[PDB]
Structures are given as structure tokens and as C-alpha cells.
Design a protein around this ligand. Structure first.
Ligand SMILES: *[C@@H](O)[C@H](C[C@@H]1CCNC1=O)NC(=O)[C@H](CC(C)C)NC(=O)OC[C@H]1C[C@@H]1C1CCC(F)(F)CC1
Ligand SMILES: *[C@@H](O)[C@H](C[C@@H]1CCNC1=O)NC(=O)[C@H](CC(C)C)NC(=O)OC[C@H]1C[C@@H]1C1CCC(F)(F)CC1
Lengths: 303, 303
């Protein structure tokens, strides 16, 4: 009756030890301290009368090293400063003694990551989200949360993928990769911005339907099959992502004995209606769990 | 369109530094190391041929101090051992140098807490759950997760409320308070056990309907009111908890200008059907968010 699925985040201790507070006299937000570097959103340089159309190149030239105040909850003297896209790269006199093994990587639509929400450099909560097909996330962020970071963990290595920047008109959120790009077409300017349509993440729905089978729920499984190619043509007219299978999904097909194409056909039928039935206690398709989530939490398999 | 509500856990770093591995030669599970004490489930003493009907008093007498192996990922020499209800209280030679300020407290149905899931003493994930009215939680726990701990945080103080013990036939979970009692009527014996009916947590549904209003969603609000007394009589015949208002809920009534009794009436009407409409993207009543969750994540208010 219970799927055994929860929104599961990584333990956050490693990342908590990397969070600092950064201020410029106007805004206060959070930075990520690794080795001798502190990363933070560049709109820390903005006075609040210019958040709608800043000239960041000019604001940056106007700063010097002691323009930036970096504190831990210590004071970290800034000895170098630079701008990469929508992030600042501050250089500090002290190497973080608790720097974890880490990489920077970009997360793809449908993938889950863990977020450490911070205010004034103080971590206050953790949660997990999936990158939506329109490069937003359905987060929980208030004023002062910018600089909060998202990350995945492979083994002992932390793969930082997100630095929080802003909220959109519809309540969702977006931010930067650590190459300084914003996800999607977004700009770090407090103005109305076009928003791309969101879509169902077809791979994650398939994962969820497998999770239902692994919990004894399979009324929706019929011998009928939709091929991947046919499903993807259907997908395009129904605001579903195109499906791309993975080894993680294949393992789920092996364990249950149910082929991907059976579940692609089931999504097509379920999209038009659950006929009053429930799947894992839901009457709507669920796309916030990944194949890796289902393999890990139900089957006991990382990879 | 997006509620700004996520399942939000506490940052887990403080508790990660307290987790150890405990073994007796049969089972390996997790313990919680605070000052000179290590807490762990008592069925670490069981050989796997006796998990269905152990004699814990006799197993305990049969143990000595070096029967228990406690390791951190160190070795902590056990110098004392005792049993409190369904937990063991091991005394070790070394005080945990990172013991947080803490209390032990019991969590009540409807209240949310954070869980650190651990295997072999290694923290592997964090998530948050509400204690169901039948004293289970809808967790994510596999073999070797016993000893994983649940906790709330008031200020800097960690209020430990849960040590994981077992899974039930229906996929939900339960465990001990740190006074050694199991929640509800449950026993730490691997046998079939009666399960109490679960119910909607009426206070948390009200919280959720307030969260909808705070996000511009209020079609369900009518001038009609159901008094608390009348709602609670209704509650008893419909598998809802009886409603008990709090200051947290009152603040939500103040902010929105919508009285509790309007929402009690709305639950009664919504219970019988959403008439095809959605609330915060859901066609079912939602009871996994507390008034404190809505105050914190949407309104910015702790208390
Ligand atoms: C961190 O500094 C801060 C986090 C935001 C604040 C509230 N929730 C969050 O996630 N970031 C900002 O305040 C940024 C700063 C810019 C220079 C990038 N701005 C916003 O997030 O603005 C809030 C948008 C929802 C407001 C609004 C924007 C104009 C509009 F389009 F017309 C209507 C929507
Ligand atoms: C930690 O040691 C372990 C965590 C469990 C394992 C799987 N998921 C979890 O949360 N705890 C146990 O294995 C306990 C040990 C007892 C001495 C308390 N036992 C169980 O959790 O048993 C699993 C129950 C689901 C099994 C079953 C029980 C008999 C039944 F009722 F007939 C049918 C249901």
C-alpha cells in the first residue's frame, strides 16, 4: 500500500561546512567556499534601486577586494575578485579546511538534485527537486536564499550543479550552473521574462509506474505496447518529454518482467484518464521520481 | 501556480557526526552516540533465527561489554550496557566530541520530523515524514537501516524523537522513542501485528488549504462555516482526526482573513469530491504539511 518512496536528499553536512555569507553593503546572500574560492551570485553587487536592469560589467569595475565582506557562522579576507557569467569568483586568503572532493557539473531536465537552503550563510533546510523541462525547479526559497546550492553526490564526490538566483512569476525557481550560465533562457534581472512550457518527464513517469509494479500495483499493465519512436511522436503533441531509455530503466524492466513499451502504452492511456483508479495513491501521473530513485530506495541498488 | 511547498528537512550535519555502527556478531545496525552513551535498537542482540519471538531479557543477560562492537566511519570501547524498553543504552569510553545540544522528546500524530537514513553507520539520505494517526510513518527504509534516527530542531537544540525499528506488512514504518517505548501499540518482534486505521490529519489539511489561499487559490472558500465541535463529531465518522487549533493555525487565519471554520466546512465538502477542480495541483486532500511548514516556507516565520 505504501510505495516506500520519499523525496530523499543527500546528507548535507559536507556542504554545510562550505557555506558563507557575502555582502556588498546592499544585498546579503550566501556564497560557496571551496579551497581559496568563494562563489556567489553577481547581483550581490546591485543596489536595490537597480535590480531590474543592472550593468554588471560597470558594477564589477566599481568594486575592489575590500568591497566584498565574507563571513562564516569568521571573516575571510578577499584578495581577488572576478565575474564568470552570472556568478562572482572571489578569492580569499584562507583555504576552506573542510573542502570536500567536488566537481562542477550541469544537471539535465528530469534529473534530481539536493538543495541546501541558506539565509545569512546559515543553512536552514534541505530538500530535493528535479530540473523541469523548462529549466525551473519547484523549490522553497525566500528573500535572502540566493547563493543556496544544489548538488548531487557520486561516491564521496560532491557534484555541484546549481546556485540559486531568482523566483519567477509562477512561483517556480531558477539559478546558475557553476560555469556561470543560467539554466534555460533565463536572465538574472528582476524583470518579466518569457517562460517555456513545462512538460511531463516521460522517463520519470515510467520509473514511477515501475515502482508501482514493484509494490504489487499493476492493473494498468496490458500486453499492448507502444514503441519508443511512436511514443515520442505522440509525446510531441501532448507536452511530454521524448523518452530516452537508460541502463537504470532497463534494470527496472528486468526486475519486474514488464517492458518499457508496455508502460509507454500505459502512459498514453493513463494520460487521457485513470478511469477512477489510483496508482500508488495518486490519480495523476507522477514525474518527480527518477529511475535511479526507484532503483535505490526500493531495490537497494546504487550505480 | 507553484505553492512554494517542498518536503523540507533539517540540515543533517549535526546528527551525521553522532552516527556509529553497532554489531553483536549477528545483525549490524546503527547507533546514536551522544556524550558517553550509544543508543541502538535492542534486536541487535538477536540471532536471525530468533527475530520472531526473542527473549530480550535473557539475550541481555547473556551479553557482556565486549559482546558489543561499536565503530565510527574508530572503535569505541563499550564499558557499560543496559536495556531501556526496546533500546539499548551502551556506555563507551570516549565522549562524542561533536555532541550537539539535544533533548529527547516524543512526537505526536500529525507532527513532522526529519530522518537521517543510515546503513553500516554511514548516513545515506535525509527526508521528512509526519507521524501518522496510527503511529506509523511513510518512510524509505531497507535492511540495515535500523538505528536511523528522527529528530526536530528548536533553535540550536536537536530534539531526538525516533529510532527506526521495523517495517509493517503494508510498507509503512515504525520505531522507538528514546524513552524506549515503541510508538503506538507496536512490538519489536518480526511477527504479524494488528495495524490501527490511519486517518487524515485535519489540522494539516487546514494548513494546506491556507497555503492554497496564500498562493491565490480559494475557489473552495465559501462564507459557510462548520464549528470545531460540529466538525469533530463529523470527523469521528469519516476517518479524520479531531481538529485542535494552535497559534500557528491562528496566524494563518490572520494573514489570509479566512476563518478556521470556513475551512472546516470546506473539508467536509471537498471530502465528498473536488468536483473536478484542483487545489495546488492536487485532486485529493493533502495532510503531510503542517501549519508550521506553511508559516515557515511561505510566510517566512519560525516560532
Ligand atoms: C535572492 O537574492 C533572491 C531569491 C528570490 C526572492 C524571493 N524568492 C526567491 O527565490 N533573488 C531575487 O530576489 C532576484 C534578484 C534578481 C537581480 C535576479 N529577483 C527575484 O527573484 O524577483 C522575484 C520575482 C517574482 C518576482 C516578479 C519579477 C517581475 C515580474 F515578472 F514582473 C513578476 C514576477
Ligand atoms: C532494521 O534491522 C530492519 C529495518 C526493516 C527491514 C526492511 N525495512 C525496514 O524498515 N528491521 C527489521 O528487519 C525488523 C526486526 C524485528 C526484530 C523488529 N523486522 C522487520 O522489519 O520485518 C519486516 C516486516 C515486513 C515484514 C513482515 C513481518 C511478518 C508479517 F507480518 F507476517 C508480514 C510482514
Amino acid at each position: 500500500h505504501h510505495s516506500g518512496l520519499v523525496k530523499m536528499s543527500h546528507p548535507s553536512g559536507d556542504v554545510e561546512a562550505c557555506m558563507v555569507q557575502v555582502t556588498c553593503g546592499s544585498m546579503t546572500l550566501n556564497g560557496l567556499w571551496l579551497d581559496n574560492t568563494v562563489w556567489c551570485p553577481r547581483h550581490v553587487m546591485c543596489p536595490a534601486d537597480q535590480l531590474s536592469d543592472p550593468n554588471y560589467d560597470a558594477l564589477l569595475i566599481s568594486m575592489t577586494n575590500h568591497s566584498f565582506s565574507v563571513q562564516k557562522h569568521a571573516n575571510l579576507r578577499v584578495v581577488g575578485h572576478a565575474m564568470q557569467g552570472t556568478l562572482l569568483k572571489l578569492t580569499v586568503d584562507v583555504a576552506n579546511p573542510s573542502t570536500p572532493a567536488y566537481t562542477f557539473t550541469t544537471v539535465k531536465p528530469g534529473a534530481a538534485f539536493s538543495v541546501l537552503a541558506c539565509y545569512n550563510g546559515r543553512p536552514t533546510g534541505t530538500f530535493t527537486v528535479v530540473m523541469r523541462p523548462n529549466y525551473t525547479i519547484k523549490g522553497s526559497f525566500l528573500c535572502g536564499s540566493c547563493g543556496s546550492v544544489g548538488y548531487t553526490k557520486e561516491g564521496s564526490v560532491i557534484n555541484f550543479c546549481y546556485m540559486h538566483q531568482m523566483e519567477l512569476a509562477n512561483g517556480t525557481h531558477t539559478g546558475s550552473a557553476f560555469d556561470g550560465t543560467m539554466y534555460g533562457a533565463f536572465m538574472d534581472k528582476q524583470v518579466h521574462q518569457v517562460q517555456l512550457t513545462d512538460k511531463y518527464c516521460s522517463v520519470n513517469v515510467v520509473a514511477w509506474l515501475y515502482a508501482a509494479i514493484l509494490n504489487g500495483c499493476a492493473w494498468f499493465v496490458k500486453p499492448n505496447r507502444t514503441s519508443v519512436v511512436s511514443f515520442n511522436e505522440w509525446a510531441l503533441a501532448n507536452q511530454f518529454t521524448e523518452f530516452v531509455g537508460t541502463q537504470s530503466v532497463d534494470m527496472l524492466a528486468v526486475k519486474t518482467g514488464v517492458a518499457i513499451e508496455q508502460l509507454l502504452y500505459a502512459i498514453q492511456q493513463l494520460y487521457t484518464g485513470f478511469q477512477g483508479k489510483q496508482i500508488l495513491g495518486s490519480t495523476m501521473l507522477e514525474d518527480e521520481f527518477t529511475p535511479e530513485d526507484v532503483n535505490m530506495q526500493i531495490m537497494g541498488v546504487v550505480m
